[PDB]
Design a protein around this ligand. Structure first.
Ligand SMILES: CCCCCCCCCCCCCCCC(=O)O
Ligand SMILES: CCCCCCCCCCCCCCCC(=O)O
Ligand SMILES: [Fe+2]
Ligand SMILES: [Fe+2]
Ligand SMILES: [Fe+2]
Ligand SMILES: [Fe+2]
Ligand SMILES: [Mn+2]
Ligand SMILES: [Mn+2]
Lengths: 286, 286
């Protein structure tokens, strides 16, 4: 359908819009390029691991590559919905969001190639709960926006994408990886990538908070919706966590070799903390 | 609809894909930030112009702000269509495309704000032909992709967007602006912006060429389609050119003051040359 007119012809960008400001910060702080990361030491590290230590790392990496690829593809309907509502500043920022995700996908894929597992099919580490979230719920919620951009639909999309996938699962995956491998002294290129990634993701979650809050500000009923959509996904969030946790207990060789007490009962609780923390960033009234 | 699996979990990015290579070049060469451009001299220049010299500049600027805003919004359906076909490398590159366009919109809008015409509604310089292209044909062709991603639909979208709007009209607008104001010594910030813009747009047109050619390579019948879609839009392309040309002849004050022989009959022919040149970049057989 036709453009009615154009905001930067009738007027200008809203320079004070929070999403314009977030866009400006993204440009400033979004310069990293995964093509510059030196993965040579990661190649050596991975090779020096035993076969059993080798796999220990793979489930988490499987979750991340899939996850970044899904969020790269699945933001597109949000950008469309907000474009069609005339939210130009949101769209500008979302170009940075989408390009960040592209770099995230690229980074993990480069790591896989470099350490020599690119030819391996890591889908084997996606259990039913992981699939429910990333192969199904996430694309369903986002694609819905093409035909239904109601407040309810937009809140649900931001909840699944920004608050659960990014704000709970991803945030926890950064923590877990850092905790295990930073302590080991392993995979410096990957950790550098994860650090840059974590910085970008700070902006993404702010967009999700802005989007959910601005809808909740129209009508408190929508607060209940937000809490409910969070709770509906929890079982799959924890059901994936348990499955990982449990894999990692069956191959604790990397833990004993590099002698780090991997407290799964501490990661499990970080995931719980993340989830509750995301709830608190939305208020019934603000 | 569900993700079947993920390319960077089953395998890796296709590092040799032409669009992956274009993506890598975009990251390297796409660092500029319109927020860094110094527009202070442009403010002085514009103020020092007479009222009649002032407007001389505005039609072209009106066409560009509208144009950048439209292409920012209207690439989204192409990214969707190619995502859904599993063309991950194209999608990665398209994140750079979309973010470039965001910077383009931002740049013109910053210039308008800086010289003090942000409050002016420049829609008055969009005639019927301009509207036919930018308010109508462009969004129609792109939005079609949501429900019809046939080769015919994808060729038509790339033709209107990449070959006509970018490759013919925009390319000619860069040339025209440089020709007039570079010679005058005016609007250095805007010209710097236009130079950065022109560099980005080199990549955009390569994507359009890749996309049209790869479809034409499946079936030569599609070459005829491409030439025909080009010709269908020409009347609106030249009909906008005439309207500009004609405005610029009625207010030739800026020409006489800054004493530059604005050869409209040379710009008109550049637009003709651009158009024919774009045709030549697609071969019936390649
Ligand atoms: C054993 C502790 C469990 C830790 C949880 C691990 C979660 C794996 C993370 C995969 C999600 C990646 C999604 C990307 C989101 C984004 O890029 O915006
Ligand atoms: C008098 C000579 C006529 C010159 C033609 C002027 C054309 C104005 C250009 C407006 C189009 C801008 C579209 C942006 C395309 C893109 O950013 O990829
Ligand atoms: Fe993200
Ligand atoms: Fe289960
Ligand atoms: Fe472009
Ligand atoms: Fe006409
Ligand atoms: Mn990410
Ligand atoms: Mn542009």
């Amino acid at each position: 359908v036709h453009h009615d007119g154009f905001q930067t012809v009738k007027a200008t960008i809203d320079w004070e819009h929070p999403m314009f400001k977030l866009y400006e910060k993204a440009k400033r702080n979004g310069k990293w390029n995964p093509a510059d990361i030196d993965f040579s030491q990661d190649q050596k590290d991975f090779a020096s691991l035993t076969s059993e230590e080798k796999i220990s790392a793979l489930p988490l990496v499987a979750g991340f590559s899939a996850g970044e690829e899904a969020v790269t593809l699945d933001i597109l309907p949000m950008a469309h919905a907000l474009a069609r509502q005339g939210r130009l500043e949101d769209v500008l920022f979302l170009t940075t969001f989408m390009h960040d995700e592209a770099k995230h996908v690229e980074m993990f894929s480069r790591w896989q190639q470099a350490v020599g597992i690119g030819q391996m099919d890591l889908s084997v580490f996606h259990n039913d709960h992981y699939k429910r979230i990333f192969y199904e719920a996430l694309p369903e919620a986002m694609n819905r926006l093409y035909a239904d951009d109601s407040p309810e639909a937009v809140i649900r999309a931001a909840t699944v994408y920004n608050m659960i996938v990014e704000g709970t699962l991803a945030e926890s995956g950064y923590y877990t990886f850092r905790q295990i491998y930073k302590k080991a002294g392993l995979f410096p290129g990957l950790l550098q990538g994860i650090d840059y990634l974590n910085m970008d993701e700070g902006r993404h979650i702010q967009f999700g908070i802005y989007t959910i809050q601005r809808i909740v500000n129209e009508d408190e009923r929508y607060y209940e919706l937000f809490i409910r959509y969070m709770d509906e996904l929890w079982p799959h969030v924890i059901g994936y966590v348990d499955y990982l946790t449990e894999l990692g207990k069956r191959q604790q060789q990397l833990a004993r070799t590099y002698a780090l007490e991997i407290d799964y009962d501490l990661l499990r609780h970080y995931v719980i903390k993340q989830f509750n923390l995301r709830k608190k960033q939305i208020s019934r009234t603000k």
